[PDB]
Amino acid sequence: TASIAQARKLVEQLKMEANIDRIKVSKAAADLMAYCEAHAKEDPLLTPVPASENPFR
Amino acid sequence: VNFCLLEVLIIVFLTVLIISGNIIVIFVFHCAPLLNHHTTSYFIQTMAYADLFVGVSCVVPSLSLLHHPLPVEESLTCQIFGFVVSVLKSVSMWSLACISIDRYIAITKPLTYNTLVTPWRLRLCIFLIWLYSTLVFLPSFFHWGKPGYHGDVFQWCAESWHTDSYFTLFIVMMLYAPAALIVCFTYFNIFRICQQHTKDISERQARFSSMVLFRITSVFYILWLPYIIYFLLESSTGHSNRFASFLTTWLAISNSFCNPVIYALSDSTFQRGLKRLSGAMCT
Amino acid sequence: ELDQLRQEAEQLKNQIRDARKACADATLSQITNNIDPVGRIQMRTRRTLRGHLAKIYAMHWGTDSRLLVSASQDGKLIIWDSYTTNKVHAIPLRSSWVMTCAYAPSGNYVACGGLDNICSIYNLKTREGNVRVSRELAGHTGYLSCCRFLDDNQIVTSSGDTTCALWDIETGQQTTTFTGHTGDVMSLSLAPDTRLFVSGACDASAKLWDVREGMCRQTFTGHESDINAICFFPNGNAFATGSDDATCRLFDLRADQELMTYSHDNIICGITSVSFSKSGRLLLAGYDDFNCNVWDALKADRAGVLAGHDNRVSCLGVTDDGMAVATGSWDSFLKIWN
Amino acid sequence: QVQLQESGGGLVQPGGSLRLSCAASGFTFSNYKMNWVRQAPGKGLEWVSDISQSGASISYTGSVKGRFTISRDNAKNTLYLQMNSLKPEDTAVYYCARCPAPFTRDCFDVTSTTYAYRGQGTQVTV
Amino acid sequence: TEDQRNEEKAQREANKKIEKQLQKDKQVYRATHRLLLLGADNSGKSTIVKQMRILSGGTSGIFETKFQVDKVNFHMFDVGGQRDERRKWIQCFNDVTAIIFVVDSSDYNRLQEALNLFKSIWNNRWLRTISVILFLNKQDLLAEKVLAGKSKIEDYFPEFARYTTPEDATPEPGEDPRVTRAKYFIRDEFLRISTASGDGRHYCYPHFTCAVDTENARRIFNDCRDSVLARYLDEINLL
């Protein structure tokens, strides 16, 4: 009773990754770079700011 | 005027290496703060302060000999200059002794060391170093005698002021010798402890098969001993060698920069702080 | 039927791997050759926050991006004003061995947890004025390695009993359990959309969990060793795991597989903490060579280093506005970088 | 995925030999110190043997010190336990186990209930 | 504004009070010595912390034990609450002066597990500097086992037959010398671990303790004193 339930559970807990509609990894790269090019200027580490804007300087 | 130039070249060389490194030691201790929270660091800071006052007090022989002799104090500045420098070296040497006193405590009471040696009593040791070194050398202003041969620079100070053999005795038995004997006792005991410990570790290791504080203290002491030896002889005898007096005094002032150099050559964390300075403060 | 279904799960794991290989149409580094490199990021210790007695093992920034909380194993949970370099509060913890601290988004609460197996919630904006523990969340058996507030009434806590849990502070019971992990759960990050969270464990697996259903949405096993710390990409559609095999990894949620590795041949010690910048272009990773390297997260290039500590860097955080980084470390001193 | 598959195993006489194998997947084999662990029936997990990253440092538990011998093929990514002179207390389930961190000398493999980087295990019996 | 400068002055006053409390607890923290207790369930770590306790420990999570001998604060942590894997929560005990590692010396099938655990402690990169106060416990049971026979060290350790006792004690093993051959051999099996690793950053301190004993706190005192003294001599060589 427990063994069949656990085996069915493990098959199901792999099946949900099988049920994942895998968007292509090229589109994954496109999404990552599109978020980074969209938010490029508002990043202080990537785009340094003057000491008037910088509260630590 | 060539001879005074030959005298002043070595002392301006001593100024331009004394001045720079003591500030570097303070900036490194401020930069690396795990290095900051040891007891020996604050005494090394106290030495850096005393050596920086040594530099900014020996700037004035450069003014006296480099150009025409300039008393801006207009009446016997060398005397108070002596009372600066002769205290300051004492302020340095007793500092070594107090380092030894903490290290000996760090060996004698190994566990309860932080119970024994606290930053309050640390600041109290530093304050009594400056206070004791100041107040015992005070009768140099009382004309009881010239305190030491710091002040050989100026041709009235080198000839008119006659040092006192008695005052020479009264300064060495409370400031010059007790620092030496406390360093001797503590480093003898610590070297004994390290020998016995290393013998035990060698035994326990071989049963189963298949000292920058000492270095800086010893360099300071050997740079300083010719000065005190000929100081005792020219005081008790009264017949002096001007060449040896000049050389031994500015050799005893030459020990001022020898702490940052050797402590940079030795210590790993101090080198990490100094590479942090050389990386960050420059560009 | 038991070994038959175990065999079926074995071919199912193999077909998941092969279907990911079929769905790995183009890698990230293939297309990013047209991108200009990020350049050399050089960052400096703007503030140096002193005043911890033992190793700092966790920190969390504030949502106002000025306050932060630091946790250290002397027993003190300290709230620091980063601007003024003033400790706003100090908290004597009941048990000093703590491994995590979390700052509430509202700021009224702060969390901590560790080897005493209770997640303590301290109220900051309190009636009396002295901060005190408001709740002690018991029920996990392993050590608590990460906690994160969703709100003033929902916190997810990871644990060393291989189970994450979603807790109600007001009742004091676990609303939901998340028991899929095999190894000790060492971190968790909640999404920007807060509907879901990913958690990494010592079993080299990072699992995506939905907070409302409470079931394992996804699993990723691309690492070799213990995943120490995890962090979502700010878009919420990816996350970066920092693991003890001297590599960071980027996993996308909808691709359901690894994207890139963030490692070099020279670096051989473990990631202890990992974080993201505001745009997510710079991936930040603390380490055990006493430094903090920053990578181009799109190009996988070691594009800077933050050397300011002489013990290992335990915790790493980035402000919500991005203006600062706070690298705590085992040398008892935390540092603010820009 | 970090996957260790066992091989060898099966029936052998009470004076016989088996070459237990473990193929490794999903990690650089050379970086990890490898171990052999056995689960005896009615007994907990107990460490049998280990080998360093380079194959230099090799150790065994005392019941099997002269009898068993291990070798690891980094070309084939396989950990080998030549099992000589079986006893009935040598009959157990045999797991290869890599140490949790790479480039390290310390190991925490043999645990009471579960450890992430063990294999599935092949049973050997009388 | 004026009110903002008043509020930042209040921030400075709060920071001053917090820093005063931090130094006031820093003195206590540096006065107290933290110790990590490790072992197994059969190894009498419970009774050993019982003689440290009798000469407020909670079960949940850490079990804490506080004691002093010769006015030195010792605070030692039994971890009774976590799981069976310890590769991560052992990293917390990196600022510890000394690990007390208790071994059941009379059970020779768990001795190899104890040796592997000691080897992991000695070779852990975050435990490379912590001395290990080894406590080979239950020497009454080891003596009774070896004198009783019917269970041999060569069953679980083949190299016992090529062993003789180099140095020993008269009064405690004075019943029979063969148990001495036992009680030092196990000791060497730890010291063979304790010697081969590292350039002397930490030191093992083996001890022989029965079921009930009194000088456990004194032994922890002297071995912590030697380890901290060795730390300060390595600092004298460095600082």
Tokens of C237: 């559609």
- Residues 66..85 of D with a Cβ closer than 8 Å to C: which? none
Calculated CA dihedral for residues B171, B177, B178, B182, nearest 10 degrees: 160
> Domain boundaries in chain D?
1-126
Q: Are E104 and E44 in contact (CB under 8 A)?
A: yes
Compute the distance between CA of residue C15 and CA of residue E222 in angstroms, rounded to an integer.
62
CB atoms within 10 A of CB C100: 27
Domains of chain C (ranges, CATH numbers): 1-337 (2.130.10.10)
Q: Given the structure tokens 């901590």, which residue do they identify?
A: C112
In order of B84, C284, C299, C320, D87, the CA distances from A36 in angstroms are 64, 15, 12, 16, 64
| Partner residue facing E197 (CB), from D62, D105, D115 | D105
Q: Tokens representing D101? A: 């961190």
User: Do residues B31 and B276 make contact, with C-beta atoms less than 8 angstroms apart?
Assistant: yes
- In the 3-class helix/strand/coil scheme, how is E181-221 assigned residue by residue? HHHHHHHHHHHHHHHHCCCCCCCECCCECCCCCCCHHHHHH
Contacting E with CB below 8 Å, chain D residues are: 46-47, 61-63, 65-66, 100-101, 104-108, 110-113, 115
Host domain of residue B159: 1-281
Find the CATH number of the domain harbouring B237. Answer: 1.20.1070.10
Mutate to test the interface with E, among D37, D51, D108 (most CBs of E within 10 A): D108
What single string gives the DSSP state of each residue in C35-94? Answer: SPP-------EEEEE---SS-EEEEEE-TTSSEEEEEETTTEEEEEETTTTEEEEEEE-S
Sign of CA dihedral B211, B215, B216, B218: positive
CA distance B184 to C178: 67
C222 touches A at CB < 8 Å:
no
Record: contact A45-C325, CB cut-off 8 A: yes
Which residues 19-48 of D are in CB contact (within 8 Å) with C?
A: 26-28, 31
φ/ψ of C77, rounded to 5, equals: -100, 110
The set of chains that have 3 or more CB pairs under 8 A with E is B, C, D
Kindly report the nearest CA distance between residue C159 and chain B, in angstroms. 31
User: Which chain C residues are closer than 8 Å to E16 by Cβ?
Assistant: none
Select the residue of E192, E224, E233 nearest B208 (Cβ to Cβ). E192
- Chain E residues in contact with D107 by the CB 8 A cut-off are 116, 119-120
User: Are B197 and E233 an interchain contact pair (Cβ–Cβ within 8 Å)?
Assistant: yes
Q: How was this structure determined?
A: cryo-EM
Q: Which residue has the tokens 């009224």?
A: C108
User: Can you say whether residue D8 is alpha, beta or left, with left for phi > 0 and alpha for psi between -120 and 50 degrees?
Assistant: left
In 3D space, the residue among E207, E206, E40, E193 whose CA is nearest the CA of residue E116 turns out to be E193
Query: What angle in degrees, to the nearest 10, is found between the helix axes of B77-108 and B39-55?
Result: 170
The neighbours of chain B, by the rule of 3 or more Cβ pairs under 8 Å, are C, E
Residue length of chain D: 126
Strand partners, C157: C147, C165
Torsion of CA D22, D28, D31, D33, to 10 degrees: -20
**What is each CA distance from B16 to B92, C289, E44, in whole angstroms?**
19, 38, 67
Q: Which helix (H) or strand (E) holds C111?
A: strand C109-114
Domains of chain E (ranges; CATH) run 2-237 (3.40.50.300)
Name the closest residue on chain D to residue C219, using Cα atoms: D1
Residue E227 CA to residue E224 CA, distance in Å, equals: 5
Do E111 and E142 form a contact (C-beta atoms < 8 A)?
A: no
Q: Are D and B close enough to touch, i.e. 3+ CB pairs under 8 angstroms?
A: no
Chain C residues with CB inside 8 Å of B28's CB? none
The number of distinct structural domains making up chain B is 1
| Complete DSSP assignment for C262-311 | E--SS--S-EEEEEE-SSSSEEEEEESSS-EEEEETTTTEEEEE----SS
C29 token code pair: 């580094």
Closest CA to D102 of C142, C271, C55, C283: C271
